Design a protein around this nucleic acid. Structure first.
Lengths: 192, 177
DNA sequence: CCATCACTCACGACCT
DNA sequence: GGAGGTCGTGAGTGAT
C-alpha cells in the first residue's frame, strides 16, 4: 500500500554521488564543512567547466612552469584587486581566492548564492552587465563598467562597488560553447 | 489562515530549491563531452559521469599552474618576461606585450630591459636586477607604442636560476590604472 | 527574550 | 509493475 523505499534509495544515491563530487573538489580540507547540496553543485559546475574550457582548447602556449604555484599565488595576492573570469552567458569559470580580503566573503562563501555572475551582483545593476556582455568580441574589446557585487553578512542582502575591466577571449569549439566566449576581468573595488 | 500562507512561501522556496538543482544537473550534461548528446541520460547517471569525468588529478590550487599563469596574464592585462641579471637582455617575452605595450615580441626579444625603460630609473632597475627565490617588486616606466595593434608598468616577480633546458628575473608586468 | 522568518534535508504520495 | 521524476509538508538549525 505504498511506493516508498525506492525513492528513499534514489535520493540517497543521488545525494551520495553529490558527496562524491564534494570530496573531489580541489578546495582546502577545512572549506568542505557546511557545503549545502546546491553549493556543492555550484562548485562542481565551476570546476568541471574550468577544465573542459581548457581541455578541448588549444594547449596553453609558453614554457612549462616558469613560476612556482605558490609564487603565482603570491602574485595573485599582491594584485590590487581580484581576478574573476566568467562566460558570456553569465556562468562563472574562475573566481580568484584573493577576493577573501577585497570583499570580506571568501571565494567559497560567495558562489553559494548561485553560479552565474548574475547571482553574485546586486540585481539592480544586472541590466548594466547585460549590455556590456551581449555584444561579443568581434572587435569590441577592453570593456570596463561598474557593479555592486555583494558584500554581505552571511546570508544575502555595505555592498562594495567594483570596477570590472577586461576583454573577451577565445572559446573552444563544441555545442555548449556556441557563441559563448569567455570574459576575463580584473575586478577592483571603488572604496579601498 | 496564516499558517497555510506561510507554508505556501515554504512551498515556493522548496520548489525553487529543486528547480535550481535541475538547472545544475542540466548544465552538468550540456557541457560535459561524455554526456554532451541522442538519448538524454537520467540524473544519477549525469552525477556519476560528473564524478568520473572530474577525476583527472584533482586532490589543491583549483587550477593548473600554467592555466593560472595564462589567466593571470589574460585578466590583469599584463605580460610575462624573463630578464638577465647582468646583461639585462630579455630571454623570453610573452605574446601579451603586443596587446599591452603595443610592441611586437621581436622589438623586445634579444634586446635588454635597459633599452626599453626610462633611463632615470634604469640605475634603480639594476638594484632590483642585482641579486645582491627572493621576491622582487618595482614600478617602472616603459616605452609604449611602436605601431598599431611611455606608460607605467608595475613589475612583480622572482629571481631564479636559468635552466634553458629544464640568475634571471621572471616577472609579470601590468599597467597601473 | 520571543517570534518570525530564510534555508536545508528527508520523506512520503503522485504523475506522466 | 517498474524506472524516473515532480510536488508539498513536517521537522530541524539559525539569522534577525
Amino acid at each position: 500500500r505504498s511506493t516508498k523505499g525506492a525513492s528513499k534509495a534514489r535520493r540517497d544515491q543521488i545525494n551520495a554521488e553529490i558527496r562524491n563530487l564534494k570530496e573531489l573538489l580541489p578546495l582546502a580540507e577545512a572549506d568542505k564543512v557546511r557545503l549545502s547540496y546546491l553549493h556543492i553543485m555550484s562548485l562542481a559546475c565551476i570546476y568541471t567547466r574550468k577544465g573542459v574550457f581548457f581541455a578541448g582548447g588549444t594547449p596553453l602556449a609558453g614554457p612549462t612552469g616558469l613560476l612556482s604555484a605558490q609564487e603565482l599565488e603570491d602574485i595573485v595576492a599582491a594584485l590590487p584587486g581580484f581576478l574573476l573570469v566568467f562566460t558570456a552567458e553569465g556562468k562563472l569559470l574562475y573566481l580568484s581566492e584573493s577576493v577573501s580580503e577585497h570583499l570580506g566573503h571568501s571565494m567559497v562563501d560567495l558562489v553559494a548564492q548561485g553560479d552565474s555572475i548574475y547571482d553574485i551582483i546586486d540585481p539592480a545593476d544586472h541590466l548594466t552587465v547585460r549590455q556590456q556582455l551581449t555584444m561579443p568580441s568581434a572587435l569590441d574589446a577592453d570593456r570596463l563598467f561598474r557593479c555592486r557585487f555583494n558584500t554581505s553578512k552571511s546570508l544575502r542582502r555595505g555592498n562594495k562597488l567594483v570596477l570590472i575591466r577586461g576583454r573577451f577571449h577565445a572559446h573552444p569549439p563544441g555545442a555548449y560553447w556556441a557563441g559563448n566566449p569567455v570574459f576575463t576581468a580584473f575586478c577592483a573595488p571603488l572604496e579601498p | 489562515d496564516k499558517e497555510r500562507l506561510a507554508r505556501e512561501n515554504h512551498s515556493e522556496i522548496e520548489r525553487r530549491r529543486r528547480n535550481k538543482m535541475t538547472a545544475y544537473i542540466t548544465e552538468l550534461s550540456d557541457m560535459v563531452p561524455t554526456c554532451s548528446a541522442a538519448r538524454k541520460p537520467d540524473k544519477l547517471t549525469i552525477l556519476r559521469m560528473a564524478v568520473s569525468h572530474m577525476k583527472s588529478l584533482r586532490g589543491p590550487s583549483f587550477l593548473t599552474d600554467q592555466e593560472l599563469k595564462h589567466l593571470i596574464l589574460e585578466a590583469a592585462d599584463g605580460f610575462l618576461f624573463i630578464v638577465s641579471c647582468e646583461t639585462g637582455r630579455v630571454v623570453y617575452v610573452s605574446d601579451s606585450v603586443t596587446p599591452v605595450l603595443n610592441q611586437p615580441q621581436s622589438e623586445w626579444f634579444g634586446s635588454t630591459l635597459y633599452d626599453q625603460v626610462h633611463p632615470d630609473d634604469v640605475d634603480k632597475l639594476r638594484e632590483q636586477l642585482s641579486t645582491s627565490g627572493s621576491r622582487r617588486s618595482f614600478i617602472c616606466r616603459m616605452r609604449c607604442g611602436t605601431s598599431s595593434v611611455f606608460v607605467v608598468v608595475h613589475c612583480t616577480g622572482y629571481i631564479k636560476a636559468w635552466p634553458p633546458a629544464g640568475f634571471c628575473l621572471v616577472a609579470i608586468g601590468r599597467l597601473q590604472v
